Design a protein around this ligand. Structure first.
Ligand SMILES: Nc1ncnc2c1ncn2[C@@H]1O[C@H](COP(=O)(O)O)[C@@H](OP(=O)(O)O)[C@H]1O
Ligand SMILES: Oc1ccccc1Br
Length: 293
C-alpha cells in the first residue's frame, strides 16, 4: 500500500521539496504537539543525524550501551515528519506515546519546523556538514532509499543539489537558517568535521547542553560506541533491520564511509571548480564556515 509513494518525484510543502510519502496530511507536522523537555536533533540530510542521535540517547542513559541496544535507533529516535502511509505509523503518531525526554529527529528547515518547538523553547541540537560531502552522502542515500526520487547520474544529482531541488531544499538556506535562529532560541550548533576531529570534545558539549554530568568512564564508553566502525557494525544503528523493499542495503549501506573528504572521490575537476565558485557566492555575507578537509 505504501508502494505507490516510493520512488516518486518530490512533493512540496511550504515551498520546500519533500519526500513523497511524507507530504500527505502535512497538518500532522504543522500542528505537532511538542513538550518543553523535547530534544530536537535537526540536520540537513546526511549531516550526522544518526551519529548525534546515538550520542544524545547514550547521554540520557548515563553511558550504558545496552539500553540503546534494546531497539533500533529509528524507534528510539523517531523522525518527526516520517510517514509510510498504509504500512507504518507516522513518526508524529509514534512520538505521542514516547515518555519524556523525547529525542526528535527532523530535517525540516528552521522556518517550517513546527512552531510548538519554538514556543516551548525545546533544546535543538543542529549538525552541519560541509556541502560537498553532504552532496555525496545524499546521492548514495537516494540510490538505496526507495522513499527517494531516484537520483539518476551523479552529475545530474549534483546540479539538483546545488539548485536546492533535492528533498528538504537548499543546503545553503538550511544551514544558514538554524545558524541565525540561535539568536532567539537555545541551539547547539555542531559540525560533523569537529566530531571527526575530536569526538570526545563534541560529546562533552552535547552533555553540557543537556545539563548532564559525565564521568570520565561514561565519556569514554559513549565515544567507544559512537565511532564510525562501532555504529556501522551495530545492528541498532546501521539501519540493516529496515526491510529490503524500503532500503536496498546492497546498493549502498547507511553507514557508508563515515569520513570527511570523500567528495574528492566524487567531484570531477570541473564539478569541483564550478561548485567552489557557486558556493563562495552563496556563502558570502555569512560568518558560518565549514571545513572540507
Ligand atoms: N559514528 C559515525 N562516525 C562518522 N560518520 C558517521 C557515523 N555515523 C554515521 N556517519 C555518517 O553520517 C552520514 C549519515 O548522516 P545522517 O545520519 O544525517 O543520515 C553517513 O556519511 P557517509 O554517507 O559520508 O558515509 C554516515 O556514514
Ligand atoms: O528518510 C529520509 C528521506 C530523505 C532524507 C533523509 C531521510 Br532519514
Amino acid at each position: 500500500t505504501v508502494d505507490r509513494y516510493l520512488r516518486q518525484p518530490w512533493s512540496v510543502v511550504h515551498g520546500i521539496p519533500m519526500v513523497c510519502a511524507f507530504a500527505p496530511n502535512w497538518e500532522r507536522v504543522d500542528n505537532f504537539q511538542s513538550r518543553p523537555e523535547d530534544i530536537v536533533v535537526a540536520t540537513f540530510p546526511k549531516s550526522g543525524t544518526t551519529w548525534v542521535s546515538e550520542i544524545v540517547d547514550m547521554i540520557l542513559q548515563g553511558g550504558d550501551p545496552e539500553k540503546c541496544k534494546r531497539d533500533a535507533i529509528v524507534n528510539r529516535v523517531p523522525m518527526l515528519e516520517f510517514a509510510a502511509p498504509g504500512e507504518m505509523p507516522t513518526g508524529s503518531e509514534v512520538l505521542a506515546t514516547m515518555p519524556s525526554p523525547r529525542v526528535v529527529k527532523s530535517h525540516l528547515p528552521a522556518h517550517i519546523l513546527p512552531k510548538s518547538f519554538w514556543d516551548n523553547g525545546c533544546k535543538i541540537i543542529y549538525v552541519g556538514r560541509n556541502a560537498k560531502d553532504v552532496a555525496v552522502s545524499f546521492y548514495h542515500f537516494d540510490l538505496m532509499n526507495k522513499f527517494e526520487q531516484h537520483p539518476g547520474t551523479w552529475d545530474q544529482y549534483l546540479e539538483a543539489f546545488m539548485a536546492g531541488k533535492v528533498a528538504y531544499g537548499s543546503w545553503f538556506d538550511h544551514v544558514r537558517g538554524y545558524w541565525e535562529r540561535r539568536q532567539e532560541h537555545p541551539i547547539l550548533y555542531l559540525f560533523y568535521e569537529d566530531m571527526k576531529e575530536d569526538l570526545r570534545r563534541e560529546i562533552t558539549k552535547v552533555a553540557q547542553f543537556l545539563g548532564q554530568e559525565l564521568t570520565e568512564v561514561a565519556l569514554d564508553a559513549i565515544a567507544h560506541h559512537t565511532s564510525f566502525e562501532a555504529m556501522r557494525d551495530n545492528p541498532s544503528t546501521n539501519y540493516s533491520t529496515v526491510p529490503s523493499h524500503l532500503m536496498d542495503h546492497g546498493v549502498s549501506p547507511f553507514m557508508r564511509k563515515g569520513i570527511t573528504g570523500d567528495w574528492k572521490n566524487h567531484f570531477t575537476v570541473a564539478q569541483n571548480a564550478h561548485f567552489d565558485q557557486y558556493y563562495a557566492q552563496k556563502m558570502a555575507g555569512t560568518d558560518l564556515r565549514f571545513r572540507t578537509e
